[PDB]
Symmetry: C2
Subunit: 306 residues, 2 copies
């Protein structure tokens, strides 16, 4: 694996001091052994997804979790501060409508919640205005602490929506992403979009989530990320150990479909295109609210700011 370690480090621009290189190699090797074992089971049809190398392969899951993941759900969620959602196609992929921006990269920051927010906002704005937009995650990271968010330490899309009822969301061009929380640089003159209300699906109902996505557009969701999620490469992800109460990272449900009998969600992540299926994960659908996808879902109603 010597050859491959050096190539992997080049691919992801990883550079370590003498104190770290061997420990990182050891983690990488352990992870690689798991990927190789898992993937042979896939070839025999014993699991429905594969694992792969990516920018996280030299991390332990506990390290990853400390950096990127935080418990997002509370029992309080049962009754949302939006409108709970209750005649749609059997399959849909809002990428095909032009309503989804390319996959972004949150970098060294636990800011998935901010990408999920901007992604659902992008979907609505592009649909309603028939034009391209990409919104600022950095604005959310830097400016929404008073609404209960914690920057790179985590947050909630529904908290961001409350912020965005009063303050207009800027474009990426106006307020670009740095992956470091800084002082709020909100400029009212550059606000483009605001939230007027939002729909929720917090019930665990995958039918309700399908209805929301199929009628309205890409929905913000949170999921329970485990080690195999960190390492996911392709196929339909499933877990027997995840919990719908332990959602800990936000993503974007852009569609749904079925492959060879097995229903799935199409989910956009913010870990770059090197993770998953060019940045996406297909997660099993209609199988127990897998990983809590229908436990913390939402979709804002968006208007021009003004």
């Amino acid at each position: 694996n010597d050859d491959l370690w050096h190539q992997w480090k080049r691919m992801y621009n990883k550079e370590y001091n003498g104190a770290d290189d061997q420990h990182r190699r050891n983690i990488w090797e352990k992870n690689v052994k798991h990927i190789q074992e898992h993937n042979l089971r896939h070839d025999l049809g014993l699991v429905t997804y594969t694992l792969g190398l990516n920018q996280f392969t030299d991390m332990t899951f506990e390290e990853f979790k400390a950096k990127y993941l935080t418990e997002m759900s509370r029992a309080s969620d049962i009754l949302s501060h939006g409108v709970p959602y209750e005649a749609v196609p059997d399959k849909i992929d809002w990428r095909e409508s032009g309503y989804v921006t390319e996959v972004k990269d949150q970098g060294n920051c636990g800011s998935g919640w901010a990408f999920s927010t901007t992604g659902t906002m992008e979907g609505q704005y592009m649909k309603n205005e028939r034009t391209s937009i990409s919104f600022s995650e950095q604005q959310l990271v830097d400016c929404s602490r008073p609404w209960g968010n914690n920057g790179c330490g985590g947050g909630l899309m529904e908290n961001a929506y409350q912020y965005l009822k009063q303050f207009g969301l800027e474009t990426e061009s106006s307020y670009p992403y740095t992956a470091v929380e800084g002082q709020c640089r909100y400029n009212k003159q550059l606000g483009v979009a605001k939230v007027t209300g939002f729909y929720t699906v917090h019930s665990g109902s995958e039918v309700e989530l399908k209805n929301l996505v199929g009628a309205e557009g890409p929905a913000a969701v949170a999921v329970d990320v485990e080690s195999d999620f960190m390492m996911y490469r392709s196929g339909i992800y499933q877990s027997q150990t995840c919990s719908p109460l332990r959602v800990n990272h936000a993503v974007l449900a852009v569609g749904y479909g079925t492959q060879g009998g097995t229903d799935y969600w199409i989910v956009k992540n913010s870990w770059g295109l090197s993770w998953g299926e060019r940045g996406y994960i297909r997660m099993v659908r209609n199988r127990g609210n897998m990983c809590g996808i229908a436990s913390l879902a939402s979709l804002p109603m968006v208007a021009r700011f003004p």
Copy 2:
């Protein structure tokens, strides 16, 4: 790997005596180690195809070669006994026209040449007659020795064409496949199709082969099969060690295309759907006549028998 060995044996209905199980496990393990190593290189972008488990994983390549492969080309081939072929689409897949039957399985028999023949015949007949047909490989295996073929020990499509100038090719239903050479059971009353002539591309010209496939339909071809070909699972196959003079197994070029800059051939095999991309291999195109694909190609002109 204990779990996986037993599952692999179940999947492929492999049963061994006490004298053999350990040696077969050892071969399988060595092959599995190679597959796992190779596939991690693919994840890093160092190779353009992957390997996988299949019904051959407990075989050595030397065993496989002895069973299935035989040198097919000779210097004599430069001047064919057909018509050498010299305005087509940039991509084509004759599966989309309905001119290709499902992938078949030659079983325990070195009869690829017979499947290649029936596949190119199927293409022409279905195109010319606008109806479904599947032709008998067994007839070719059992009946074409006088024309220089050797049954499960190998043969040539162009020898089969000469046979088929006089004798009509039966359907699979009339003369089904057994994978064992037997006495010729030709029944003139059940002959459906004959050959009136054939085109050849023996020059090494991939442009000429593209022209033939793109204008006329699926072409019989022979390729130099090496160990990674035996283990191919997905992607665009390439080899730096194959030779255009060592073609040793026949297949069917059903089309061609390009993916992310890299041109390819779409090739139907006769090793069942458990091998390759549901029985197919995409082989790099326009890169040195890779594996001899344009060294022994042909396509018959087919007519009703009569």
